[PDB]
Amino acid sequence: MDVLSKGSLKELLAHLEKTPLEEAISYRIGTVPYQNVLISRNEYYNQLYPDTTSLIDGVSREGQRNVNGLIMSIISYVVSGSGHYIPNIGFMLLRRSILDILTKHDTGLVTNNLNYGIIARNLTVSKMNCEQRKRMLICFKLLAYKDGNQNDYEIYLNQNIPLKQIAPNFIPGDMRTVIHNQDQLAIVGIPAYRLTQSTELSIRDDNAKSYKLGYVDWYNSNSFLRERSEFNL
Amino acid sequence: ANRATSAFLDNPHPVGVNYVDEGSRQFVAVAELLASKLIDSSRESDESNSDVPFVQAYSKFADDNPRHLRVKTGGKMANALTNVIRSYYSINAPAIVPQVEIDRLASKATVSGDMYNSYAIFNSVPIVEVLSPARTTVSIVGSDRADVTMLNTGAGAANITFNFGQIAETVILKGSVPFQLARLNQPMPAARFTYKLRPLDGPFIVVLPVGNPLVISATAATRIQVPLAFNKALVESGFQTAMNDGLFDIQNVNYYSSFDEFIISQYHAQDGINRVSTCVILGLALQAYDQMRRALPVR
Amino acid sequence: ANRATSAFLDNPHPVGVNYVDEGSRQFVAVAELLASKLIDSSRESDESNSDVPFVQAYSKFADDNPRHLRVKTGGKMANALTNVIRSYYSINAPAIVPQVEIDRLASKATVSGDMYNSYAIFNSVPIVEVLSPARTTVSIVGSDRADVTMLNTGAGAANITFNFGQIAETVILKGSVPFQLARLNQPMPAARFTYKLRPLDGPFIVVLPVGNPLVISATAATRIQVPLAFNKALVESGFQTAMNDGLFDIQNVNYYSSFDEFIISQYHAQDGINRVSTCVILGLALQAYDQMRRALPV
Amino acid sequence: ANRATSAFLDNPHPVGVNYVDEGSRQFVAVAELLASKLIDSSRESDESNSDVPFVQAYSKFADDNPRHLRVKTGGKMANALTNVIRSYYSINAPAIVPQVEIDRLASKATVSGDMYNSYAIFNSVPIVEVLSPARTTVSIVGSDRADVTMLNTGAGAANITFNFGQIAETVILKGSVPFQLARLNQPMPAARFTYKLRPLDGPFIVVLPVGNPLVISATAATRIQVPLAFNKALVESGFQTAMNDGLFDIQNVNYYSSFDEFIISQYHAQDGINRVSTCVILGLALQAYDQMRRALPV
Amino acid sequence: YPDADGNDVSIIFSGAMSHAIFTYAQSQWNKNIIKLDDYIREITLTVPKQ
Amino acid sequence: HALIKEDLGQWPVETGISLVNQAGVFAVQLANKLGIDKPFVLDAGSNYFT
Amino acid sequence: KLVGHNYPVYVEPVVNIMNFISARFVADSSYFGYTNEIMIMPNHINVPVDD
């Protein structure tokens, strides 16, 4: 809910600096993705509603134990709000910040073999909105510039023309680009009053709607409950 | 040798492993409490010819005010409850309700999500196996009362083995004609109509004389820990309602006539102790479902 | 070819057409409401060690204070409730209660006589017909759980046609041994213990192999709209009380074991949707009769 | 002339002759009232997040305030109720509880010990005997719904005599096929599916055709005087808990599947009127046992 | 002594009926004491959507 | 000899008159005496000596 | 109207408090100075008493 509230690149990067990798990994066992299922939407239809499960839903799903699974878990947290179940990663790695994983070599993770096309297909980029895609491209650029793969990122953008139009205008390692960036990346914000307490047909739309409706209540009450446990640590 | 088994005990499908934490248990208990208020408010609204009692209860339940143009289906609380019910029934059903929505709906009322405060009694009789010799025919019929029809055509009397599951506490056997039943490697008593047995003692042997058939009627009682709010009458009604609405229409799942057959069958499978806890939570969820649908009707 | 049918589905007698308007429906609702308070007054009497809660409840129900001389009968409300129950069962039963008396009794408490607020699930299994070929024996027995015993003495396997009607929603079939069932003009699957079927799908064919008999247990669930105050436990008890008290002893009527069988039999008759509404009102009346008579035995 | 009888009607064991006086009847009624408040306080305490209603209810029941490090046994009342149930079942069970303890516990609440206020309907079918001639096979299965299967292998049609006793009020007979039934030495009617009979009318003759089996389904209703607080759902739950807990385990006693079968069997035995009175007191005691055990799981 | 929350629990010698009546009264009033944030949520449902 | 007594006052009752009516009337007076008739919260954390 | 009035779902707490006191008044009579039984006996009859 906090990560989805950020609406600027410099807010999003600041949040990733303070957030450990533990928050991007779920301890719930979940279900296997890419499964054709029938769900109940009784507000609209008497019959069951066909849908397919995906990693970028708001619900935690089982994840693979490879490096590909950990990168997919990070991106899913940014774009959907929840991570995936990857057990026994390691105490040292889980303490590191998300930005440290993406942009630093001291972590001990190797991401040179990652294929950006495969990761996008596994995350169902075709079903992602403009804000979600821009967030995903930010994570790709950070990973590419860490590995010296700047050319591969540009070539990958040439192949996918629609992704090129919405590519973020920031160069990692340059502070000027982050300062002057004017991107809008807020999936969840203070709702327009027109929003109602109604369900949505798709799994993704309903879960995103749930985050939107609960943002006002979370905004008012998160500070005190966080402080009630943070003090005397 | 022939083997006969109860139909409802065959191949229990795995149950869901999600929405069984402490927070999810609170959500089910809150839904049951708020559904009970909804069904009571509809009675008051009908009596007084006013929508004030129903609007107050529906707003608490659905976090939204009823509107004439829209359709009253229970709101987001109804959507989560129906989808969690499917998750409990089978492991093939997905988990599509986010944890943020579960936590939000559990804060509406303050209750303790303890599913082991009380106990309930279930009457499904488990006959795991009945073994008969070559020249005997054995037929098992029924779940609440199992009638076992046995006929011997061979020259000599036949010994027929009855195996009841180790879970059940008490089994009572009544025959159309007096018969002899005894434990394995124990002396045969005189023929009598009624036997009371504890299935944990061991397999039982029934002596069948040649001639007219003998029918044995079996009844069983098992105690399963349940929350205090558990109501078997409401749980059974919700189970049939969910089946008619198609909530349990999932691939590679087994279907049962009653919730009693479902809970007993899952208990008798391997990892049955783990499975029963999920079934009890599903029982409370079905109790909330039944009260919600009766309050808000769809023709 | 032999035909077998359920015993309780045969020849449903016509139900009464009186006392089914808005005014009479509120009379039954008031009787149910006031009879509930009559039973609850007994518990309140024990707590206070006084009979004044029961006197208050009886006076509202019977329009007269109870007397130690005579047996408590319930007064005009009890007489009106007994007579409308008779009229609901059969068309031949007279409609002797005046409208004005129903008018006055319905004004005692505020209720809406709407019998379509909620739904109830009735568990009677309708088997309209089982069609079997020659040299096969089919026996249908039971209403709540229908056991169909089939034996074929022929040379080869026989096909048995099952017709469950069009009203029931779900029918579950469980066999003693695994068997094969499929709809008309469909391939036959592997032998399986449990089948879930919808009666609207069509007739069902069961392969009956030669050898030991095969028994199929059937359970059904049907949803019928009922008022919110409906309680199946109390309705069933009232049905047995009315039968024992001789409220159904009329000429040319059929008798049933439970209200479950009674409501399903009239549903499956020709133009059966007319009878369902009347039978539902009778069920609520029997619910009031059960509570009123348990508090005031005669 | 072969004879077939219902299994549950065979050899009812004598019931206890203790704790049946007026003072003891008040103890059972008081325990039921206090246990009902105990189960209601526990439900209220869970929702209200305050344990004050339960603490008050437990103090009344157990005469001692609940403690955190001590087990919620139930006190002297729970121990007394458990032993009185043992005495009711058999005459061979000892009467441990003294009369002084019963009188002290009965003074905790004021409630009429009357056990003849109301009535309850019991659904066990009392088939005392079914007389059949040679070359015919008869089997009786079931108690709630009695299933009588008859097969005639003789040359001509046979007559089967049915005896339903004189205690049951009404019995409804349903057959898989239309059949003929008439009273003893009375003209036979035309075949029909359903018969409503009065068991006191006398033994009934059924004409059994040759060749095809005939299955007759029997349902019965009997009325027994019970206290107004009697609840059949709670009595049945208490009966099975009592059997599982093992307090019905005495030498030379018959065991039954339900309290319905237990009370009908005692009614049909010799001096059945006297036995039924003790059974009703046991039923109310079992009702309190179910409510107290569910509130306090020991 | 303090409880898990900040409330103070007093353990004193007092009569049984006075304890039962007083504490039950406390529970009934405490049911209607709610946080301001929950109160604000209740009002927003009643008021129009803007 | 020593003993502890709980004194809630004396409330005579009449046999002819209904007990529920008398109990309810006495209930109003008892609530006023204990100070629980109006919405209240207990403030007794300061009643201590160290 | 007084006789036939039904308790509202959201009843005021004072009503619940009074019903609690009224129930205690009837259930626990000894606390408030009345009982349901007395025994009158001559002095020469000796009976066990609470010592």
Best probe of the E interface among F32, F36, F49, by most E CBs < 10 A, is F36
| Phi-psi domain of A37 (left: phi exceeds 0; alpha: psi -120 through 50; beta: other) | beta
Taking residue C213's Cβ as centre, other Cβ atoms within 10 Å add up to 16
- State the Cα–Cα distance between residues B22 and B114, nearest whole angstrom: 9
Note whether G36 contacts D: Cβ–Cβ < 8 A. yes
- State the Cα–Cα distance between residues F49 and G16, nearest whole angstrom: 35
Asked if E20 lies within 8 A of D56 by C-beta distance, the reply is yes
Q: Which two tokens stand for residue C3?
A: 């035909």
Residue C145: exposed, middle, or buried by beta-carbon count in 10 A (0-12, 13-18, 19+)? buried
CB C4 within 8 A of CB D176: yes
Taking residue D180's Cβ as centre, other Cβ atoms within 10 Å add up to 18
Asked if B249 lies within 8 A of A197 by C-beta distance, the reply is no
For residue E27, list chain B residues with Cβ-Cβ distance below 8 A.
Answer: none
The Cα of G44 is separated from the nearest Cα of chain F by a number of Å equal to 26
CA angle, A64 then A66 then A69, to 5°: 55
Asked if B42 lies within 8 A of C114 by C-beta distance, the reply is no
CB D166 within 8 A of CB D201: no
Which strand (E) or helix (H) includes residue C277? helix C273-295
| Phi-psi domain of D99 (left: phi exceeds 0; alpha: psi -120 through 50; beta: other) | alpha
CB B121 within 8 A of CB B33: no
CB B123 within 8 A of CB B219: yes
Q: Which two tokens stand for residue E25?
A: 């009264």
Taking residue C107's Cβ as centre, other Cβ atoms within 10 Å add up to 12
- State the Cα–Cα distance between residues D87 and D94, nearest whole angstrom: 6
Alpha-carbon dihedral angle through residues D151, D153, D158, D161, given to the nearest 10 degrees:
-40
For residue E37, list chain A residues with Cβ-Cβ distance below 8 A.
Answer: 217, 220-221
**How many contiguous H segments (helices) and E segments (strands) does chain F have?**
1, 0
Q: Which two tokens stand for residue B149?
A: 């029809």
Which strand (E) or helix (H) includes residue C36? helix C22-48
CB A196 within 8 A of CB A32: no
Chains sharing 3 or more CB pairs under 8 A with chain G: B, C, D, E, F
Asked if G3 lies within 8 A of C109 by C-beta distance, the reply is no
Best probe of the D interface among B28, B110, B118, by most D CBs < 10 A, is B118
Of D176, D228, D233, the CB nearest to C141: D176
Residue C168, C-beta contacts closer than 8 angstroms, at least 6 positions apart: C125, C126, C199, C220, C221, C222
Note whether D48 contacts G: Cβ–Cβ < 8 A. no
Structure-token match 């809008």, residue found: A184
Residue C130, C-beta contacts closer than 8 angstroms, at least 6 positions apart: C3, C4, C5, C138, C140, C148, C160, C161, C162, C163
Which long-range contacts link A114-121 to residues 24+ away (Cβ below 8 Å)?
A: A114/A67, A114/A68, A114/A71, A114/A143, A116/A140, A116/A144, A116/A152, A116/A153, A116/A156, A117/A156, A117/A159, A118/A68, A119/A68, A119/A71, A119/A72, A119/A75, A120/A160
- State the Cα–Cα distance between residues B204 and B161, nearest whole angstrom: 6
Asked if C109 lies within 8 A of G26 by C-beta distance, the reply is no
Q: How far is CA A180 from CA A11, A175, A177, A187, in A?
A: 13, 9, 6, 21
Chain G nearest-CA residue for C53: G3
Of C7, C143, C297, the CB nearest to D176: C7
Comparing C-alpha atoms, which of B76, B77, B71, B19 is closest to residue B280? B19
- State the Cα–Cα distance between residues C126 and C144, nearest whole angstrom: 9
For residue A41, list chain B residues with Cβ-Cβ distance below 8 A.
Answer: 79
Residues 1-50 of E with CB under 8 A from D: 16, 20, 23-24, 27, 30-31
Three-state DSSP string of G14-30: HHHHHHHHHHHHHHCCH
Asked if B42 lies within 8 A of C117 by C-beta distance, the reply is yes
Three-state DSSP string of chain A: CHHHHCCCHHHHHHHHHHCEHHHHECCCCCECCCCEEEECCCCCCCCCEEEECCCCCCCCEECCCCHHHHHHHHHHHHHHCCCEECCCCCHHHHHCEHHHHHHCCCCCCCCCCCCHHHHHHHCCHHHCCHHHHHHHHHHHHHHHHHCCCHHHHHHHHHHCHHHHHCCCCCCCCCHHHHHCCCCCCCCCCCCCCCCCCCCCCCHHHHHHHHHHHCHHHHHHHHHHHHHHHHCCC
Q: Indicate the residue type of E6.
A: G
For residue E45, list chain B residues with Cβ-Cβ distance below 8 A.
Answer: 59, 63-65
Comparing C-alpha atoms, which of D204, D207, D171, D174 is closest to residue D186? D204
For residue E16, list chain D residues with Cβ-Cβ distance below 8 A.
Answer: 59
Q: Which two tokens stand for residue C106?
A: 């319905």
Residue C291: exposed, middle, or buried by beta-carbon count in 10 A (0-12, 13-18, 19+)? buried
- State the Cα–Cα distance between residues C42 and B188, nearest whole angstrom: 53
Asked if B99 lies within 8 A of A30 by C-beta distance, the reply is no
Say whether F27 sits in a helix, a strand or coil.
helix
Residues in chain D after which the chain is broken, C→N over 2.5 Å? none
Q: Indicate the residue type of A220.
A: N
Say whether C184 sits in a helix, a strand or coil.
coil
The Cα of C134 is separated from the nearest Cα of chain B by a number of Å equal to 24
Asked if D60 lies within 8 A of G27 by C-beta distance, the reply is yes
- State the Cα–Cα distance between residues E29 and G12, nearest whole angstrom: 9
The Cα of G28 is separated from the nearest Cα of chain D by a number of Å equal to 9
Asked if B99 lies within 8 A of A206 by C-beta distance, the reply is no
The Cα of E26 is separated from the nearest Cα of chain G by a number of Å equal to 9
- State the Cα–Cα distance between residues C255 and C248, nearest whole angstrom: 8
- The answer, yes or no, to whether G and C have at least 3 beta-carbon pairs within 8 Å is yes
Chains sharing 3 or more CB pairs under 8 A with chain B: A, C, D, E, G
Comparing C-alpha atoms, which of B166, B171, B167, B198 is closest to residue B183? B198
CB B259 within 8 A of CB B286: yes
Note whether B64 contacts E: Cβ–Cβ < 8 A. yes
Taking residue G43's Cβ as centre, other Cβ atoms within 10 Å add up to 5
Asked if C56 lies within 8 A of G26 by C-beta distance, the reply is no
* First vs last C-alpha separation in chain F: 32
Note whether F17 contacts G: Cβ–Cβ < 8 A. no
- State the Cα–Cα distance between residues G48 and C49, nearest whole angstrom: 29
Best probe of the F interface among G22, G37, G51, by most F CBs < 10 A, is G22
Q: Indicate the residue type of C284.
A: L
Q: Indicate the residue type of B10.
A: D
Residue C89, C-beta contacts closer than 8 angstroms, at least 6 positions apart: C15, C16, C247, C248, C250, C253, C282
Alpha-carbon dihedral angle through residues B32, B34, B38, B40, given to the nearest 10 degrees:
80
Residue B165: exposed, middle, or buried by beta-carbon count in 10 A (0-12, 13-18, 19+)? buried
Asked if C121 lies within 8 A of B49 by C-beta distance, the reply is no
Q: Using the Cα atoms of residue D141, residue D144, residue D146 and residue D147 in order, give the sign of their dihedral.
A: negative
Chain B nearest-CA residue for E38: B108
- State this model's resolution in angstroms: 2.6
Q: Indicate the residue type of A61.
A: R
- State the Cα–Cα distance between residues D236 and D127, nearest whole angstrom: 22
Q: Which two tokens stand for residue G50?
A: 């609470």
Comparing C-alpha atoms, which of D257, D279, D258 is closest to residue D268? D279
- The answer, yes or no, to whether C and D have at least 3 beta-carbon pairs within 8 Å is yes
Comparing C-alpha atoms, which of B179, B246, B240, B237 is closest to residue B213? B179
Q: Which two tokens stand for residue C197?
A: 């079927």
Asked if G13 lies within 8 A of E21 by C-beta distance, the reply is no
DSSP chain B: -EEE--GGGS-PPPPP-SS-SHHHHHHHHHHHHHHHHHHHHHHHHHHHT-SHHHHHHHHHHHSS---SSS--S-HHHHHHHHHHHHHHH-SSS---S-HHHHHHHHTSS-----S-SEEEEE----EEEEEE-TTEEEEEE-SSSEEEEEEE-SSS-EEEEEEE-TT-SEEEEEEEEEEEEEETTSPPPPPEEEEEE-GGG--EEEEE-SSS-EEEEEEEEEEEEE-TT--HHHHHHHHHHHHHHTTT--TT----SSHHHHHHHHHTSTTHHHHHHHHHHHHHHHHHHHHHHHHS---
Note whether B60 contacts E: Cβ–Cβ < 8 A. no
Q: Which two tokens stand for residue B164?
A: 């009841």
CB C177 within 8 A of CB B137: no
Structure-token match 């049984």, residue found: E16
Asked if F10 lies within 8 A of G25 by C-beta distance, the reply is no
Structure-token match 């506490």, residue found: B169
Best probe of the G interface among F6, F11, F14, by most G CBs < 10 A, is F11
Residues of G at the F interface, defined by Cβ within 8 angstroms: 13-14, 17-19, 21-22, 25-26, 31-34
- State the Cα–Cα distance between residues B40 and B212, nearest whole angstrom: 57
DSSP chain D: -EEE--GGGS-PPPPP-SS-SHHHHHHHHHHHHHHHHHHHHHHHHHHHS--HHHHHHHHHHHSS---TTS----HHHHHHHHHHHHHHH-TTS---S-HHHHHHHHTTS-----S-SEEEEE------EEEE-TTEEEEEE-SSSEEEEEEE-SSS-EEEEEE--SS-SEEEEEEEEEEEEEETT------EEEEEE-GGG--EEEEE-SSS-EEEEEEEEEEEEE-TT--HHHHHHHHHHHHHHTTT--TT----SSHHHHHHHHHHSTTHHHHHHHHHHHHHHHHHHHHHHHHS--
Asked if C141 lies within 8 A of D112 by C-beta distance, the reply is no
> In this structure, what DSSP letter does residue C9 have?
G
Chains sharing 3 or more CB pairs under 8 A with chain D: B, C, E, G
Note whether D294 contacts G: Cβ–Cβ < 8 A. no
For residue E49, list chain A residues with Cβ-Cβ distance below 8 A.
Answer: 193-194
Which strand (E) or helix (H) includes residue C104? helix C99-106
Tell me the pairing of strands C136-141 and D118-122.
Answer: unpaired
What is the number of residues in chain A? Answer: 233
Say whether C114 sits in a helix, a strand or coil.
coil
Q: Tally E–F CB contacts below 8 A.
A: 29
Q: Indicate the residue type of D26.
A: Q
Chain C nearest-CA residue for F20: C48
Asked if B99 lies within 8 A of A82 by C-beta distance, the reply is yes
Chain G nearest-CA residue for B48: G6
Helices (H), C202-258: 232-244
For residue G6, list chain B residues with Cβ-Cβ distance below 8 A.
Answer: 44, 47
The Cα of G37 is separated from the nearest Cα of chain F by a number of Å equal to 13
- State the Cα–Cα distance between residues A31 and D36, nearest whole angstrom: 45
The Cα of E45 is separated from the nearest Cα of chain D by a number of Å equal to 24
Q: Which two tokens stand for residue A114?
A: 């990652």
Q: Which two tokens stand for residue D42?
A: 């526990």
Q: Tally B–C CB contacts below 8 A.
A: 79
- State the Cα–Cα distance between residues D188 and E24, nearest whole angstrom: 72
CB B248 within 8 A of CB B238: no
Residue B186, C-beta contacts closer than 8 angstroms, at least 6 positions apart: none
